[PDB]
A paper describes a structure:
One central protein involved in the formation of regulatory ribonucleoprotein complexes (RNP) is the coronaviral structural protein nucleocapsid (N).
The importance of the central core network is further supported by the mutation of residue Q58. To restrict its polar sidechain contact to W108, we exchanged the bulky glutamine with a similarly sized, yet non-polar, isoleucine to maintain the local steric dimensions. This is reflected by high RMSD values of 4.552 Å and 3.198 Å for Q58I and S105I with the WT, respectively. In contrast to that, the Q58I crystal structure reveals a complete disruption of the core network Q58-W108-F171. This influences the structural context of the carboxy-terminal stretch (171–174) in Q58I recapitulated in the Q58I R2 relaxation rates for residues 172 and 173, which contain significant contributions from conformational exchange.
Residue numbers in the entry: 48 to 177
The structure:
């Protein structure tokens, strides 16, 4: 019923997802500068897979706007394992109820894209590539 608006950010390795301050918010042209704030949550569920379903086993992090998702009531900066906070310069510290979450039966996920100039996290590239 509820899901991230964006595809997963897979972090290939045993390191938390991190972004320098002012970076890490996925691009969404249907959002305003005041909205660019939220959290990434590490997915708990393991990959069951099946025929032709071959996802990388490394931890997946899903972006949720502030005031939405499984940690909707957490204030910005709250310390919780598997939760990392991100905010673009100019974003307002208010719940983004008007964006909300995605219903995976009705809308496809937006491919997660980060803007140029973003410092890419350690583990952004799969093992054996770089």
């Amino acid at each position: 019923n509820t899901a991230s608006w964006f595809t997963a950010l897979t972090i290939h390795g045993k390191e938390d997802l991190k972004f320098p301050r002012g970076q890490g918010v996925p691009i969404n042209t249907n959002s305003s500068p005041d909205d660019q704030i939220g959290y990434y949550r590490r997915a708990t569920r393991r990959i069951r897979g099946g025929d032709g379903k071959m996802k990388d086993l490394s931890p997946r992090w899903y972006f949720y706007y502030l005031g939405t998702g499984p940690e909707a009531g957490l204030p910005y900066g709250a310390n919780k394992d598997g939760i990392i906070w991100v905010a673009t310069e100019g974003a307002l510290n208010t719940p983004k109820d008007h964006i909300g979450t995605r219903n995976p039966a009705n809308n496809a996920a937006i491919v997660l894209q980060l803007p140029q100039g973003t410092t890419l996290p350690k583990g952004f590239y799969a093992e054996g590539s770089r």
